[PDB]
């Protein structure tokens, strides 16, 4: 019945992994800083009307364990009735938090919900949580576990994407991310991180290498425990895997956090909030977990059917740049026009904070739709384990 609307979508900058600016900032602090920015924009918001806080986190251990969402509620001084729950659906965890928030608002039993995610990969590296699929040999042997970097190379092998091809997308992401920054696209949505004294720590995406050239990308060496033989046991018609992915055409490992406010039209009207976009549809699907990164295509198909829409009805496509071939595969499958796809750069340039990316690229499209004065945007991410999450937003 109720319709779910996005009222705010902010994110911290993404600090790099080696000698990063954010490496000294606890991930809990990143979330609190975004909560305090929402307060700055809406000081007369009745926080008692925020019924939940839903954060994605792929590695909920160490500084990110013990339900980091509830910690953000108490540490930021929000009301104790504001809930707080962590969830983990791997790479899509950030968008999954937003989807769940919307679906909660549609059911009527929540009024105003904060959703997002946090990942300080320089403090909590991926894999810090362990996992059965990886460490238990009985079920590892049976689900044919293979790291995503190999699935991405396998994708490029089957589809015929050359090293030049994946590198050309990498160069394009750097160019489009740099042009968006210099164009002021990100001025209102990227909240600089400061310390307890107000001194600046980070106000831009450090992983960006905007002086990237096609020649420098070819100098890089590929990332390449016998996981190659495991993959080719299932994809038996493929003789050899072409290892095309390097650190220059793969998503950067960064720290960052993102926050989104979501509520009903009645909930927003009661708090003086102007809706910025409407959550039209969400869909979760999947594909083979050995190749692992082909989830976006069926998830995007499902959400277009569920919303009564087609590729022609979508103005902007944003797919998480986990690897170059993943985006190229998606672009080939659905015949996405090149000028509609990841228009402001993506994770290859700016970085991929696991628990937070979904809420970041979601907020990136709420901003770009308003700037271009466009209507719809489809947001998707490939997920570890063969999953796929897609979402359609409509500008208001």
């Amino acid at each position: 019945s109720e319709e779910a609307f996005i009222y705010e979508a902010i994110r911290t900058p993404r600090g790099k992994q080696k000698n990063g600016s954010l490496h000294e900032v606890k991930p809990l602090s990143l979330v609190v800083g975004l909560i305090d920015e929402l307060r700055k924009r809406h000081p007369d918001l009745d926080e008692n009307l925020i019924s939940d806080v839903i954060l994605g986190c792929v590695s909920p251990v160490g500084d990110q364990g013990g339900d980091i969402a509830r910690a953000a509620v108490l540490a930021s001084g929000m009301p104790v009735t504001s809930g707080g729950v962590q969830l983990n659906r791997f790479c899509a965890s950030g968008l999954e938090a937003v989807n769940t928030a919307a679906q909660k608002v549609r059911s009527g039993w929540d009024d105003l919900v904060l959703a997002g995610g946090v990942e300080s990969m320089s403090r909590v590296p991926m894999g810090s949580d362990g996992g059965a699929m990886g460490l238990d040999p009985a079920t590892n042997y049976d689900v044919m576990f293979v790291p995503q970097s190999i699935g991405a190379d396998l994708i490029a092998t089957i589809e015929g994407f050359s090293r030049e091809d994946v590198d050309a997308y990498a160069l394009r992401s750097q160019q489009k991310a740099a042009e968006a920054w210099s164009g002021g696209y990100f001025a209102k949505s990227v909240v600089p991180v400061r310390d307890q004294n107000g001194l600046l720590i980070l106000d831009h995406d450090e992983h960006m290498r905007p002086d990237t050239t096609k020649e420098g990308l070819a100098k890089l060496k590929p990332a390449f425990g016998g996981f190659d033989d495991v993959a080719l046991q299932k994809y038996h018609w493929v003789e050899k895997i072409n290892h095309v992915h390097t650190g220059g055409n793969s998503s950067g490992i960064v720290d960052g956090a993102a926050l989104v406010m979501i509520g009903s039209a009645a909930a927003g009207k009661l708090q003086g909030l102007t809706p910025r976009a409407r959550i039209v549809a969400t869909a979760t699907s999947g594909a083979d977990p050995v190749i692992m990164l082909t989830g976006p295509t069926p998830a995007t198909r499902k959400v277009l059917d569920r919303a009564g829409l087609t590729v022609d009805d979508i103005d902007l496509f944003e797919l998480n740049e986990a690897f170059a071939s993943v985006v190229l595969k998606f672009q080939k499958d659905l015949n996405i026009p090149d000028e509609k796809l990841n228009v402001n750069g993506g994770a290859i340039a700016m970085g991929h904070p696991l628990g937070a990316t979904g809420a970041m690229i979601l907020g990136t499209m709420v901003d770009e739709l308003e700037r271009r004065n466009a209507r719809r945007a489809l947001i998707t991410l490939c997920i570890g384990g063969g999953m796929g999450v897609a979402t359609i937003i409509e500008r208001v």
Partner: protein, 722 residues
């Protein structure tokens, strides 16, 4: 750029010997002690660049001093002036300072510290950056990180390096959290220092010898700290280690228990900086330490504590309240009149300082239980090893407990501690003033009786003075010297020197009924009793007292002082004005007397007492005063106690009872246990921080908000109003 820098004199003398061992001798020519000031930072900047330029001809470094002390403290004149907007400069200064020490640390070659004297605060931080430390075991030499006592933290690598050496828990508990100072023997014992020598002249030779040996015996580990080695293991584990992670959530709660919930942000910041620093590399850790340091220096608590325990305290120790021009006069034989818990405590701290005491009472049965106070205390010190058996026997042998008045001959210092009764003191002083030495000091330990009135019971009124101690005398550090209108400036200065000779701090106070300490601590106690009579829960009153920063909650303190003594003071004040609107506490005092409960002396008071030990609040207390019927905010209870004393301290400053804000702060802090975070009951006015503002102006705002709700006694005097 990012350098070892940022007009001032050069502080470090450079000397490279024929072996390639550089001797950096710090000798700031602006004062007697090496301070971490803008001059030092510049000098150490140049020297570190030179150690790197001439790295080919340098095999080792030695850091020494040309002062009596090694290196002590920071530039407090500067840090007390940092505003919140200066946090950028503060962060850059401590990072520059630590960038220098870090470069010295990773020089690729051993660096040894030659600690000839006190290495305190910033000084010990320099030595912790060296790979080896050698201390000259000399008298008065101390080593520690006392930054927390000024509301600061060891911001020059102290927190980071001590945690690297001892682990989180041991570095916090032993060194950082209370800024404990160590004698060179104790320093080597805990790992702060590595080895000792007999005299200072052996330091640099022993250092250059240690460099020469380290290079040949340990060629790969020369100039490499344990935490810069691959495979380093933090003592007790890192916060990710499961053994430490099991007990780690209890460190902030154990600290909250020790501080009783008071607003001291320095120990909180130290524990945070330690744990977060132990989660990251050494360089990221030291930067976190910088941010927590700037977080303190720009805050108000640090400015209060820096004003009190540095500027105010040094102004007092330097003879600020001492009359100018007077000369010293030695003391040879003290005579204590009365062997109560005061007279016995006066006989102990007088003998612990090396003075020959004569302790008289009204009976040999009671004078022996009086000297036995010095024996039961010398037994606690021999069981814990703090004193030898030879110095504990020479201490108790300078006490002679008697009941006769003839064996008072040769006494050149009389500190009377008899009961609080004027004509009794006139009698006790009359029968000794002639058989003691002729021109000796005549001192009284009265707590409310005017020294002017007591001075008429002797012939030499110019040598009659108040010398007010506090119980327990062995542990309280203040001596309130009361100047009667007959007292001369010499007797003032002589008791001033007596206080500094027994290891206590003196304030000078003009004669008035109640003096400073008693009168002010009266308003503190009466505020709690009023609240109790207003129906507030006693548990909330004690919690408000503890959480305000006081060493003892108010109702617990109201048992130590007799409730009958308070009734007496109230009758006295009413007598004076009539020959006065009563304070609401005066009804609680008499009501408690009427019920027969009056404190520890009666075995029954606000608390209950089983065979001499305190045990719980009296259960009948809630029915008597209808407790629970009034439930004001805790912060209102906290401010009511703090503001009553702060307002009463301004009244004393207005009336000429006190002559300096230094005496008002140190007097309130060391005398009546005013919370240290306030910096003293006078500093509390100019440094109040609340919701509605900060400074003297906000103090008045909060004063009127309290006066509108709880009584006009919370109305500020005019001297606070512009």
């Amino acid at each position: 750029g990012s350098s070892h820098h940022h007009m001032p004199d050069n502080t470090i003398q450079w000397d490279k010997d024929a072996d390639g061992i550089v001797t950096l001798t710090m000798d700031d020519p602006s004062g007697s002690t090496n301070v971490m000031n803008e001059a030092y930072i510049e000098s150490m900047g140049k020297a570190v660049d030179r150690l790197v330029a001439e790295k080919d001809s340098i095999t080792g470094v030695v850091v020494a001093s040309a002062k009596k002390t090694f290196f002590a403290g920071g530039d407090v004149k500067t840090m007390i002036q940092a505003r919140p907007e200066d946090a950028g400069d503060v962060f850059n200064t401590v990072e520059t300072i630590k960038r220098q020490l870090r470069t010295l640390e990773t020089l690729g070659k051993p660096v040894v510290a030659a600690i000839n004297g006190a290495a305190l605060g910033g000084g010990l931080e320099i030595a912790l950056a060296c790979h080896h430390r050698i201390a000259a075991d000399v008298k008065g030499s101390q080593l520690g990180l006392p930054e927390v006592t000024l509301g600061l933290l060891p911001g020059g690598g102290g927190v980071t390096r001590t945690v690297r050496m001892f682990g989180i828990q041991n570095a916090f508990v032993s060194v950082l959290a209370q800024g404990t100072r160590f004698k060179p023997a104790k320093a080597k014992e805990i790992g702060l220092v590595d080895e000792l020598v007999a005299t200072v002249e052996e330091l640099v030779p022993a250092a250059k010898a240690w460099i020469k040996e380290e290079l040949k015996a340990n060629p790969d580990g020369a100039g490499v700290q344990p935490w810069d080695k691959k495979g380093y293991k933090m003592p007790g584990g890192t916060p990710s280690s499961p053994g430490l992670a099991a007990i780690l959530p209890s460190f902030p709660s154990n600290l909250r228990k020790q501080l009783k919930g008071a607003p001291m942000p320095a120990p909180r910041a130290i524990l945070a900086a330690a744990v977060e620093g132990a989660q990251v590399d050494f360089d990221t850790a030291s930067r976190i330490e910088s941010r927590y340091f700037a977080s303190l220096v720009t805050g108000q608590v640090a400015k209060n504590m820096m004003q009190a325990f540095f500027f105010d305290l040094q102004a007092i120790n330097a003879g600020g309240s001492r009359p100018e021009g007077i000369g010293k006069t030695p003391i040879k034989r003290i005579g204590v009149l009365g062997a109560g818990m005061m007279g016995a405590g006066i006989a102990y701290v007088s003998a612990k300082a090396g003075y020959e005491v004569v302790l008289k009472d009204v009976s040999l049965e009671a004078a022996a239980k009086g000297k036995g106070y010095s024996e039961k205390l010398e037994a606690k010190a021999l069981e814990r090893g703090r004193t030898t058996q030879e110095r504990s026997d020479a201490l108790l042998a300078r006490i002679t407990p008697t009941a006769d008045a003839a064996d008072f001959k040769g006494v050149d210092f009389v500190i009377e501690a008899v009961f609080e009764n004027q004509e009794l003191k006139h009698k006790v002083f009359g029968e000794i003033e002639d058989i003691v030495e002729p021109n000796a000091i005549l001192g009284s330990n009265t707590s409310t009786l005017p020294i002017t009135g007591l001075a008429t019971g002797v012939k030499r009124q110019e040598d009659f003075i108040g010398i007010h101690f506090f119980s327990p005398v062995d542990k309280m550090p203040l001596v309130e010297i009361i100047k009667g209108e007959k007292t001369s400036d010499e007797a003032l200065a002589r008791v001033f020197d007596y206080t500094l000779a027994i290891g206590k701090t003196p304030i000078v106070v003009n004669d008035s009924r109640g003096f400073f300490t008693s009168r002010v601590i009266g308003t503190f106690v009466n505020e709690a009793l009023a609240m109790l009579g207003e129906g507030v829960e006693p548990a909330s009153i004690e919690q408000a007292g503890s959480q305000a920063g006081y060493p003892a909650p108010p109702l617990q303190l109201s048992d130590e002082l007799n409730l009958e003594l308070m009734h007496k003071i109230a009758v006295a004040t009413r007598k004076g004005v009539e020959d006065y609107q009563p304070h609401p506490a005066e009804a609680v005092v008499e009501k408690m007397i009427e019920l027969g409960r009056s404190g520890r002396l009666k075995g029954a008071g606000f608390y209950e007492y089983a065979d001499g030990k305190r045990s719980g609040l009296w259960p009948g207390l809630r029915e008597t005063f209808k407790s629970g019927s009034s439930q004001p905010p805790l912060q209102d209870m906290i401010d009511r106690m703090l503001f009553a004393e702060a307002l009463e301290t301004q009244k004393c400053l207005d009336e000429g009872v006190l002559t300096s804000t230094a005496d008002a702060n140190i007097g309130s802090i060391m005398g009546i246990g005013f919370p240290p975070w306030t910096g003293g009951s006078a500093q509390f006015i100019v440094g109040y921080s609340g919701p509605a503002g900060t400074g003297k102006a906000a103090f008045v705002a909060r004063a009127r908000e309290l006066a509108a709700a709880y009584g006009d006694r919370f109305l500020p005097p005019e001297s606070l109003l512009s």
